[PDB]
Here is the input.
Amino acid sequence: MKAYLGLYTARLETPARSLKEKRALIKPALERLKARFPVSAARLYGLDAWGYEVVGFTLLGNDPAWVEETMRAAARFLAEAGGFQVALEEFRLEAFEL
Here is the structure.
């Protein structure tokens, strides 16, 4: 029996000019993402910058098709948040034996 993990990562571009303005664009969208989808989200790199950031989210399930479909729906949702653009993205699916 395997545990399946989806890992989504993306480069966001924002029009911000301060770290506080940038957080106000990104954090509320990630909080909405967490409320709507069963994911763990994180701000990963570029945290010293105002205009770009690498973020991601992951999720776990026992059905790889459900994990992937949910991950792609959550990614579409993130691109619809506005405030920032999803400039580049990557999807991954890993399986772990239990």
Notes: The longest strand covers residues 85-97. The chain is about 35% helix and 40% strand. The chain has one domain: 1-98. The helical segments are 19-36, 64-80.
